Symmetry: D2
Subunit: 237 residues, 4 copies
Amino acid sequence: ADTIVAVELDTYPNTDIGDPSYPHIGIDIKSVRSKKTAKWNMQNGKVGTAHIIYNSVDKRLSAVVSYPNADSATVSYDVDLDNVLPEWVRVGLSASTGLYKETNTILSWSFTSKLKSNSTHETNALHFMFNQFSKDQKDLILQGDATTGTDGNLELTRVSSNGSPQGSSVGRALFYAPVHIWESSAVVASFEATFTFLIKSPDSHPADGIAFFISNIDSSIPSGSTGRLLGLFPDAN
Amino acid sequence: ADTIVAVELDTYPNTDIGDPSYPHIGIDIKSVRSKKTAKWNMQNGKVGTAHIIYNSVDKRLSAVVSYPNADSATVSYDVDLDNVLPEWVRVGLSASTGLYKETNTILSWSFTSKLKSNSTHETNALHFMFNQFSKDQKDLILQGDATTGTDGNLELTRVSSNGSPQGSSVGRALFYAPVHIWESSAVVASFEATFTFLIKSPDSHPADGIAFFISNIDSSIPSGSTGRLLGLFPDAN
Amino acid sequence: ADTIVAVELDTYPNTDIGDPSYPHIGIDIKSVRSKKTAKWNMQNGKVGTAHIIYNSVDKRLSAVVSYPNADSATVSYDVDLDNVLPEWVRVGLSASTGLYKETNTILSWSFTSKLKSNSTHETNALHFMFNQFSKDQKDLILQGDATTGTDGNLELTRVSSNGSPQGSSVGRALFYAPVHIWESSAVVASFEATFTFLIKSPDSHPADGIAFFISNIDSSIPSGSTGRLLGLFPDAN
Amino acid sequence: ADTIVAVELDTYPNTDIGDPSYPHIGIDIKSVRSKKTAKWNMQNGKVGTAHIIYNSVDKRLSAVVSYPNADSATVSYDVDLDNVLPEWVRVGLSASTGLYKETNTILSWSFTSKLKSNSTHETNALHFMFNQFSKDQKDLILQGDATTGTDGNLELTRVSSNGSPQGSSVGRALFYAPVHIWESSAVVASFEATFTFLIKSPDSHPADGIAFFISNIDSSIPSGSTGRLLGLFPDAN
Ligand SMILES: OC[C@H]1O[C@H](O[C@H]2[C@@H](O)[C@H](O)[C@@H](CO)O[C@@H]2O)[C@@H](O)[C@@H](O)[C@@H]1O
Ligand SMILES: OC[C@H]1O[C@H](O[C@H]2[C@@H](O)[C@H](O)[C@@H](CO)O[C@@H]2O)[C@@H](O)[C@@H](O)[C@@H]1O
Ligand SMILES: OC[C@H]1O[C@H](O[C@H]2[C@@H](O)[C@H](O)[C@@H](CO)O[C@@H]2O)[C@@H](O)[C@@H](O)[C@@H]1O
Ligand SMILES: OC[C@H]1O[C@H](O[C@H]2[C@@H](O)[C@H](O)[C@@H](CO)O[C@@H]2O)[C@@H](O)[C@@H](O)[C@@H]1O
Ligand SMILES: [Ca+2]
Ligand SMILES: [Ca+2]
Ligand SMILES: [Ca+2]
Ligand SMILES: [Ca+2]
Ligand SMILES: [Mn+2]
Ligand SMILES: [Mn+2]
Ligand SMILES: [Mn+2]
Ligand SMILES: [Mn+2]
C-alpha cells in the first residue's frame, strides 16, 4: 500500500472507527485512526485557513486551523518523518464525501520545503503558491473527482453545475514535482504548507473532510476510500 | 521539432554558423544563430555566475554573466514570449562538447516564475533552489550524459573519474514540474534564473558551452546536437 | 529639497500643471510633471492593484495598475536610477486630497529589493509584506495625516469616523529601514513593489491620488504639498 | 535593563558563572546563565553555520550549529516568547573577547519573521539577507567595536590591520527595522535566523563567543559586558 502522513480536517464523526464525537483535526501517521486529535468548530459556508509545519530539529508535526474571529484548533504530534516516509515524496490535498456531503473547495495552496546540508550554507528549497487554479493545470496531478478552474478554485470533490456538493465522491491534487523531505546527512530539513478552503453543505452534519498529505511519489487513491477514509487509506486499520 | 528559447554561454566560435570570432553570450529564439550576442571573456577554471530575467510588462529577455573582479557580459533582446513558447513549459540547463571540450559543471541553480491575474492580487509562483545536487535527484529530469551528485555538483557533460572533460558529449537537466510561463489573461508574468558554473579545460579553445533554456514540456536532446548545437537544436538553421 | 522618484496614480486632472485631461498613471523623476503617463480608468469604490518593477540591467521603471475584469494601465520610462537617487533610500506610499477628495486606503503593500555583487553569488535582499496594518506599527514611519490600524488598513489621508474622506489632506508611510538601491560595483540590482488600494469618493471627480515613491532617507512631506503635489513635491516645477 | 533572548555560541568555559567545562551552545532567557546548553566542538579557523528557529504553535526555541563533515550541536528550550519579550523588538548579532580572544567574523546573516492573523490568510512578513556587508551599511545599527565592509564581512569585535583579534572587545549589529515578534490575536507567528561565521584565534582557549539575540528596540551594549557577558547582559545573574 501507499505510505501516508496527513493532517485531516475531519468534518464527520465516525465513532465506529475511533473518531471523537465531534468534528476534529488530526495527525494521521500511516492510519486514518489519528495519533492525536483536537476539537474543531468547522463553520459551514465560511472560508477557513489551515497551516501545517514541521522541522527535523524538533521532530514535531503541527497544524493550526482558523476562521476569522474565532478560536483556532491546533494539534501536534512528535514524529520523526525519517522513520515514516521515503526520502522523496509527493505532497497533496485530498477530500471525500459519503452518505453526507460538502463542498471541498480549495481557494489557495502554498508549500515550502527546505533541506540543508553541513556544507557551507548549501540549502535547497522548493516553494509553490497557487492562489488561482486553472484548468489543465499541468503542475498538478488530479486524481479521482478533483477538478480545477471553476471560478479559479480547486474542487476536490464533485459539485453540480450550480454548486451543490455530491455524495460518494473522492478526489486529490498532488504537486507534480517530487519533494526531498529528508536526507541521511542533512543538518536541517523543514516544511510548511498553508491552504484556504470553503466547506459548505446542505446537511446538518457535513462530511467527510479535507486532508493535506505526504506520500510515496506514485500514490493513488485507494480503492473504496470515499467517505470516512478521506481518499487516503484502503481501510480503517 | 521542439520549441526553444535559450541564453547561451558559448565558449567556442563556430564562425561557419554565424558565431562571432570570440566566446560570447547570446539570446537564442528558435535558432542557434543568436538574435543578439555580446562578447564574453570566459575564465578557464574560475566559477562564474549567470543571471537571466524576463517580465511581460517590458517583454525583454536579458542576461548577465560575471566572474569576480571582472567586467560582466550582458545581452538583451526584445521578445514577447507569448509569441514564441507554449503556455506551459519546462526549464532546464544544457551543455555540450565537440572536438574541443570543457567541464560543464553546475554548482547551483535557482529559478522563480510568477503569474498574476487581475483578480485581487491573486498570484501564483514557483521557486526552486539547488545549491547541492544529489544522485537520484527526483525533481530533475537528466538527459544524455548529465549526472548529479559527484561532489554535490551537476555535471552536464561527461567527465572522467579524475575530472578530465570528454569530447563529443551532450547533456541536460530539466526541472520536473511544468512551469506556467504566460496566460491569455494574466496581468503580469515574470521569471528569473541564476546558476553558477565552472568551465575548465585543457584546451586553449574550450568548447562548446552551457545554456539555460525554456522548452515544450516533452523536449528531448535533438539527435546529433553535440558540439556547436549545445544540446538544443537539430541543425544550425 | 528631497530627491523623489515615484509612480503616481493620479486621479485628478490638473491641466494647468501638465496633467492630461483624464485620470492617469505616471512616472515622476524629480518633478510632479510626469516623464511618461498612461490613461487610467480608476474605478470608484473598487479594490485596485499596482505593481512596480525595475532592474539595473534594463534600466527601465515600469508600472501596471489593474482592477478585476478590466484592462490594465501600464507605463514605463527608461531611467538609470544611479543617476537620480542616492545609494541608500527609503521607500514609501503617499497620497493627498485637495478641493476634491477620496479615500486613499492601502489594504496591502509588499516590497523586495536585491543587490548582487560579482563575488560568488553574494546577494543581499530585503523583503517585506504588509497584508494587515496595526496601530503603532513600529516598522513604518507615518507622516502627516496617515494612520494605521483602522480595520487593519493604512489610511494615507484623513477619513472621518464613518469613512467619509476629507479634503486638503496629505499623508505618507515609509518603511523604517533604509534600502540599498544601487552600488558602484554591483552586478545587478532590482526591486519590485505591489500594493492594493481602495479609492472611494462622493465626488464625481475624485482627487488627488496615491503614489509609490523612493526618496532620500530623511524625506519629509514638503510644506503645502496637499492636492496636486501628492505629498511629494514642494512645487509643480 | 534591556530584555534579552539569545542563542549563545560560547567558546570559553566560565565555570565560575555556571558554564559547563567545554565550549557550548546555549539558550539564554533574560540571563547569561543558559536555560539549556549543549556541547559544541568549535573548530578554530573554519567557517561555521548557525540556524535558529521558533514558532508560536510549538513555543520552542531551537538552534543548530554545524561545520562541514562534523556532527552538529543542537539545543532547544520550551519558552513562550509572549511571556518574555515586548511585542516589537530588534534582532541582532553580538560578540565579545576578554583576556582570551578570537575573530568574531560574520560572513552572512539572514532572518525571516512572519505574523499571521485569522483574517483570511492575511500574513505579514519581514525577510533580510546579507551575504556581503558594506561600510556605512545603513540598514544595520553597529554598536561598540563592530565594523562592516572589511573584505565584505561584519567584524563584531576588534581585529588589527592584519587580522589579529584583540582582547577586551565587544560589538553588536542590529537590523534597523523593528520586528513584530508576537501579537495578542495572531494565529501563528514564527521566525528563523541563519548566520555563517569564522572564529579564529592564536589562543589554545579562544574567547568569548557570538550570539544571535532579540531585544527591546532601544537595546544598547551594557556597561562592562566584554568577556563572558557576550555584549548582552550587565551581570551574570
Ligand atoms: O458521509 C458520512 C459517512 O457516510 C457513510 O456512513 C454512514 C452509514 O452509511 C454507515 O452505515 C454508518 C456506520 O458505519 O456510518 C454512517 O452513519 C459512509 O459513506 C462513511 O464512510 C461516511 O463517513
Ligand atoms: O568542439 C568544437 C567544435 O568541434 C567540431 O568542429 C570543428 C571541426 O570538427 C569542424 O570540421 C569545423 C568546421 O565546421 O569546425 C571545427 O573546427 C564540432 O564538434 C563542432 O560542433 C564543435 O563546435
Ligand atoms: O483636489 C483637486 C484640486 O483642488 C484644488 O484645485 C482646484 C482649484 O482650487 C484651483 O483654483 C484650480 C486651478 O489651479 O484647480 C482646481 O480646480 C487644489 O487643492 C489642487 O491642488 C487639487 O489638485
Ligand atoms: O576571555 C576569557 C575570560 O577572560 C577574563 O576572565 C579570566 C580571568 O581574568 C578571571 O579572573 C577568571 C575568573 O573569573 O576567569 C578567567 O580566567 C574575563 O575577561 C572574562 O570575562 C572572559 O570570559
Ligand atoms: Ca471522520
Ligand atoms: Ca559556438
Ligand atoms: Ca493631478
Ligand atoms: Ca563563557
Ligand atoms: Mn478523524
Ligand atoms: Mn553562439
Ligand atoms: Mn499627474
Ligand atoms: Mn555559556
